[PDB]
Amino acid sequence: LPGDFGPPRGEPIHAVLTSPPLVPPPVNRTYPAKVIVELEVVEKEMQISEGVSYTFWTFGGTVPGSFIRVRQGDTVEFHLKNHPSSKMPHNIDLHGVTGPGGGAASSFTAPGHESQFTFKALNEGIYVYHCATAPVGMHIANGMYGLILVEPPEGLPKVDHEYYVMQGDFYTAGKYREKGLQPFDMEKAIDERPSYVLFNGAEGALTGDKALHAKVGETVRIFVGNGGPNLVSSFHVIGAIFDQVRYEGGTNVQKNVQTTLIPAGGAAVVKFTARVPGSYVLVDHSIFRAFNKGAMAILKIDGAENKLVYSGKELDSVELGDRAAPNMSAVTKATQASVSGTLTVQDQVQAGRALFAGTCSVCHQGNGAGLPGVFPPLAKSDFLAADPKRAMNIVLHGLNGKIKVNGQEYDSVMPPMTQLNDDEVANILTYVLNSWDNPGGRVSAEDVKKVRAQP
Amino acid sequence: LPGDFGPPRGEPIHAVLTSPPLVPPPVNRTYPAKVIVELEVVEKEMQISEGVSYTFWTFGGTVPGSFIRVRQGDTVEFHLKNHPSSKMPHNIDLHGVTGPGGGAASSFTAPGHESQFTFKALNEGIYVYHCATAPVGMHIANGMYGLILVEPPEGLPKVDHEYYVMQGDFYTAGKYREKGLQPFDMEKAIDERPSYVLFNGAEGALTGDKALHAKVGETVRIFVGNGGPNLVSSFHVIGAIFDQVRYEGGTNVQKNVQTTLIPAGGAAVVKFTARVPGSYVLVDHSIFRAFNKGAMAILKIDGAENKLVYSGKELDSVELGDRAAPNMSAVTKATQASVSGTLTVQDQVQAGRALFAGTCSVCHQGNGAGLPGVFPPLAKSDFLAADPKRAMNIVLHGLNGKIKVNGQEYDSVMPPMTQLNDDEVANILTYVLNSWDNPGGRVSAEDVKKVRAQP
Amino acid sequence: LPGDFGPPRGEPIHAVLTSPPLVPPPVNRTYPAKVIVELEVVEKEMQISEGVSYTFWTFGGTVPGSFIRVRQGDTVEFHLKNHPSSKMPHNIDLHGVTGPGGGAASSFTAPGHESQFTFKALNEGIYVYHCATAPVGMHIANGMYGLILVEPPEGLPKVDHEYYVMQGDFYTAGKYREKGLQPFDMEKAIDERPSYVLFNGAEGALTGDKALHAKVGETVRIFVGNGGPNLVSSFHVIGAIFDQVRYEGGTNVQKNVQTTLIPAGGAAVVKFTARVPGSYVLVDHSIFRAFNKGAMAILKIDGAENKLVYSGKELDSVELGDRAAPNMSAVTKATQASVSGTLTVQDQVQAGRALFAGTCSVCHQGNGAGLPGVFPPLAKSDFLAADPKRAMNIVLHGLNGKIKVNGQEYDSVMPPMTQLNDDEVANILTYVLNSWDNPGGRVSAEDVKKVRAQP
Numbered sequence A, B, C: 001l002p003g004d005f006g007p008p009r010g011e012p013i014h015a016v017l018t019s020p021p022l023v024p025p026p027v028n029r030t031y032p033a034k035v036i037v038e039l040e041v042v043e044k045e046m047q048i049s050e051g052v053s054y055t056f057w058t059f060g061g062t063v064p065g066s067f068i069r070v071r072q073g074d075t076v077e078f079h080l081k082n083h084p085s086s087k088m089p090h091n092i093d094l095h096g097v098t099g100p101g102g103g104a105a106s107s108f109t110a111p112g113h114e115s116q117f118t119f120k121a122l123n124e125g126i127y128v129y130h131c132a133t134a135p136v137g138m139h140i141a142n143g144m145y146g147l148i149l150v151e152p153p154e155g156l157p158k159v160d161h162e163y164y165v166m167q168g169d170f171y172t173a174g175k176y177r178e179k180g181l182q183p184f185d186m187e188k189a190i191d192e193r194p195s196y197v198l199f200n201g202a203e204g205a206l207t208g209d210k211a212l213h214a215k216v217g218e219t220v221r222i223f224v225g226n227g228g229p230n231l232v233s234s235f236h237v238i239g240a241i242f243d244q245v246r247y248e249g250g251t252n253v254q255k256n257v258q259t260t261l262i263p264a265g266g267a268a269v270v271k272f273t274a275r276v277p278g279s280y281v282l283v284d285h286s287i288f289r290a291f292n293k294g295a296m297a298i299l300k301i302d303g304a305e306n307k308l309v310y311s312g313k314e315l316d317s318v319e320l321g322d323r324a325a326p327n328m329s330a331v332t333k334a335t336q337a338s339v340s341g342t343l344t345v346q347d348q349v350q351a352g353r354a355l356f357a358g359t360c361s362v363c364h365q366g367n368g369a370g371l372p373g374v375f376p377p378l379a380k381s382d383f384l385a386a387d388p389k390r391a392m393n394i395v396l397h398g399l400n401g402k403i404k405v406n407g408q409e410y411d412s413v414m415p416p417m418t419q420l421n422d423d424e425v426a427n428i429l430t431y432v433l434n435s436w437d438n439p440g441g442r443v444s445a446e447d448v449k450k451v452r453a454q455p
């Protein structure tokens, strides 16, 4: 057989698993071992977006699940526990396992139980693991996937950083950024029409203050999975190139590519060398996923600029939108205050401030000044103040034709923004009204609901 | 030119074509030949699913069409007949043909006619062939695709088994498993929203008693096509690895991968070595296709277990659902009896038995016992017997909150199952009522239609 | 660093950019240079289909944008101008640029402004460039993408022809071929449900009198991009094979393939050797894109037939439909005449003539003769003349069952063609009525609207 390094030697090893985006250290071992893996399924509510809860089903309490790292030829004794608070039964299929279901029929586990099975890791590579419990699509859609690395016997070449990034498509009853606890939507899942496409199980999981880091001159290896369930990732790094891309345990290694297709259920190891400082964006280049459904992660490189290689500036809200900023915690706070019935004007203003970035600032500027004759001002805007109800209709339904703002004529087009939720329009407009010497007061989600219902 | 082995020699050869999932024997020849291919288009109703008929358009009476096997450098004299019962005209485009339309403009054939054209097979490889008659998408969607192998002059390396598997997406007016003769749906086809995604033209075409077979230690080569028309396959083998994947006649060979993307209209040769016994599942790992639309095929390996490689069990209904069992012939029978107006309680019970597997058994068990305090029993269930109408609402619309069943409290969640058709809910519940000392009687499709219409 | 050929030498070079489908000449240079690129964003209405206008956003006035050609190790001084008639701000992200946003944060440009940034071209290859202005998906969907080639220092091998072909998916408020100025549809874009999938920004951009050309024996290199925003191309050449496919600046080169997957935002260089004359069709083999949404381009090879390689005929309307003919200018004319209120019977007849090809001729023949007993005649048809209103219902809703036409019984099936627009049915039927000794008169779009509204 391949990976035939004889029976386990040394002492049994209790595998150290890591939560995303971190990876366990290299096994750093010259002999095959008995590796004991203990993984516990937890079902739990987490925020899939600010003020949006979802009941995830997880391996080890995270999406993706805990990272497993073994050596080709190891004997893996796999213990799957299902937490007693679980409502569903669960199991595991590991890609790279030689045997039926990749472990599925020997890991079937009711709430409060444990199952175990043993496999030899014959196949070197990076592999997806996921739940394989009927209905399989529902279990995977809820977050039940992760990566197992089977190292080659000599180990992978040393790098400065190893990170763990996994794409998933998600199906909520509600629309993108519609607030509240969102049920799984089986109709959207069967139709392959996700409301969110994410890295590491949430909007902003790898942006702002949760960006991945490295320094100019350092090597980064990223273990990249695609849990699906349904989508194929046009996986891409903005502003850089992959030194290498290797799929699963394939003999083929592609070098010097920027855009690579990762199948649903697929995985790849990519290598990046940091050359110049700034934010390097990992996306699904099926662009509405990256820029309208959440599929953007950041590798932030710190170090000296090299003007001979790139003379230009770090990214801002023009490219990264409301994910340029460290976090949108103000949106979470305002959503919680709406639920409690304690929502203040200032709660709305700080939420609107976070949401205004990119969404409105690309044309009206971060300071609401616009560009005289080209983009009208929101700062001290006579037009805004004259009719707050018209302002709600402009965000929902757009505006075109000649207008006069602060003594100047505009003859341009503001596209409609009907995909903004009622709370988002209300918070953005309350921010604008309470900024730049505008008249203050507030716009409520309920105000916007009535305007949406009759344009 | 490539494949320049001079003029045909020896005797003209009448090509032996095979129906899926079988392949013609290796050409086993050292000289180029004149190969005469005779292929006849037949339009005909076949079962796309149990009790679901569809009018397929076929090359040779099967989906995919008859497998053609020639040698690089052969002169192929291609005869396309259109059966006189056909309503549409048809033609053929073979990938790997050097010339306009791959044969399309010289193979255009009205019902009851024959066309012929000659081509030299310059290009070694595995290639899709399909109909290229306006509207091309409708002809391909109805089943008009297959494979032609152009062998290299020295032939392919010998293996124990060669099989023929081809994925297709299908567009019915009705929903998945909605019974009756289903028309082609052009709106779903243009939208790329298939109701079925299949191997070899039907649900269960390669599962249960129609699984592919091999023995521990044997090599299997699978000629894998993707007829589309629209989908890209994340083609994957559960519990195993491909020794090799080679696309069309590409110089590139990928080795040691589990998950590979097959383009719409693409084809690949994969090689598998059987290591341990059990069912190895070929899927489109765009998981709702594999587990909700029919895209699952089985390679069943018989032979000695190796507990050093895999300690675990063969797959069952937890993973393969209602395709674990040899066949669902009882569903076909019950559908026929509904049409005839002769549907008996026992017809419903045997259909419901087949459908209960995985769909209900994953939580309630194959024997309806459930798991005390975790999954309530369907066996001798006081709760079921108290209100059969409530049971219909529970399958369609789900159940949550505290209930008491056979003296025990449950506080859990049964997801809704509204994608089940009225006949499916009726048959499953009639099976349950007539099992495990439950009260008997029956639930009709019409009973379920009324409950669906007002939750 | 890679591409470390020292500082720029010689004179600064003003890059010569080309409009699709042409490519600038090889740089033909042994030293690294300072290359000045000047690219101007223009927003403008163009015909996305005959009689269908769309407001495109373009780099250099075309979709795809102007082709840029530099050498690995060049210092590129990039000048982006935004035309003063623009309503939106714009920027550029070039794949293959080493630095944040690929130029995005240093190229942000309001209407009537200019931005500049400098980069070293470290990475050899073919690369997509696109707008990266919030909302990024809307800018790319409107046409803001093109290719930059970074040549290897020794240059690419010489070929007879170099062409520029770029796929895009497009989202109109109206359905496919619905006439008038079509707004961008954000709902369809987010759902990844394009109304058009095109090469070079229009239906027929590379068909008929706009086909690419070469001669038997000549080599063709095609720089193939996929601007997306959302779709992955099953990129395929009908009737031929690619000698080579190379993605971006990848070390991997695939040889001898017919079907290759291009990611959203991806690019590839393909090489084709012309062997036999005729039309070679470039498609997205996700077949409803190629044959129902516009994703078909033609490489027309002129030269001597070789009956030893391919005995068959050039393509016609059976395969290429209404794109076999040089152009459909008559449809543009009839649409303009409807807007003006000057629409004549002859305007309708010539538009219907263009649309009848393939759509109706595949079964009824180019001369309306049909095939006695199999396809009924439209030529001198007693059945057509007896009830023009029934003829409208037959095109929209199909026809089956026994009929008698010109003394012969037919018992067959004409599929419904409800995806035809009201003007298309009206023009086709007016063409038929004014041909082949039929009674004349006309059918109006308004006649068809009333029949569609009550079958």
Ligand code: HEC
Residues within 6 Å of the ligand: A358, A359, A360, A361, A362, A363, A364, A374, A375, A376, A377, A378, A381, A383, A384, A391, A394, A395, A399, A400, A401, A402, A403, A405, A410, A411, A412, A413, A414, A415, A417, A428, A429, A432, C088
């Ligand atoms: C460009 C792509 C824009 C984005 C994004 C946003 N707005 Fe805008 N807005 C824009 C233009 C060109 C115009 C004028 C339209 C015309 O007919 O010429 C506007 C107009 C407004 C107004 C009214 C005028 C004013 O007070 O200055 C308001 C209140 C306004 N826009 C608000 C607004 C908000 C809140 C945005 C994000 C949600 C937003 N705009 C985005 C161009 C663009």
Ligand code: HEC
Residues within 6 Å of the ligand: A088, B358, B359, B360, B361, B362, B363, B364, B374, B375, B376, B377, B378, B381, B383, B384, B391, B394, B395, B399, B400, B401, B402, B403, B405, B410, B411, B412, B413, B414, B415, B417, B428, B429, B432
């Ligand atoms: C788990 C994923 C389940 C599947 C699949 C099916 N059912 Fe279920 N069912 C489940 C639970 C947890 C519960 C209790 C809900 C609660 O509020 O605590 C139920 C309940 C029922 C009942 C009523 C109670 C009883 O008689 O035991 C019925 C009649 C029932 N379920 C039927 C049923 C059928 C027919 C299924 C397949 C179609 C099915 N269930 C699937 C959990 C799960």
Ligand code: HEC
Residues within 6 Å of the ligand: B088, C358, C359, C360, C361, C362, C363, C364, C374, C375, C376, C377, C378, C381, C383, C384, C391, C394, C395, C399, C400, C401, C402, C403, C405, C410, C411, C412, C413, C414, C415, C417, C428, C429, C432
């Ligand atoms: C085959 C795939 C067809 C295409 C494409 C079109 N038509 Fe057709 N048509 C076809 C058949 C088999 C029949 C007879 C149906 C039967 O019940 O046996 C028809 C019938 C008509 C008729 C009425 C009969 C006649 O006058 O000959 C008309 C007026 C007609 N079809 C028009 C028509 C037009 C305008 C088409 C393109 C828009 C078209 N047909 C396409 C088969 C096929």
Ligand SMILES: [Cu+2]
Residues within 6 Å of the ligand: A057, A088, A089, A090, A091, A131, A132, A133, A139, A144
């Ligand atoms: Cu699970």
Ligand SMILES: [Cu+2]
Residues within 6 Å of the ligand: A093, A095, A128, A130, A265, B285
């Ligand atoms: Cu899997």
Ligand SMILES: [Cu+2]
Residues within 6 Å of the ligand: B057, B088, B089, B090, B091, B131, B132, B133, B139, B144
């Ligand atoms: Cu056909």
Ligand SMILES: [Cu+2]
Residues within 6 Å of the ligand: B093, B095, B128, B130, B265, C285
């Ligand atoms: Cu094809």
Ligand SMILES: [Cu+2]
Residues within 6 Å of the ligand: C057, C088, C089, C090, C091, C131, C132, C133, C139, C144
């Ligand atoms: Cu732009």
Ligand SMILES: [Cu+2]
Residues within 6 Å of the ligand: A285, C093, C095, C128, C130, C265
């Ligand atoms: Cu990009």
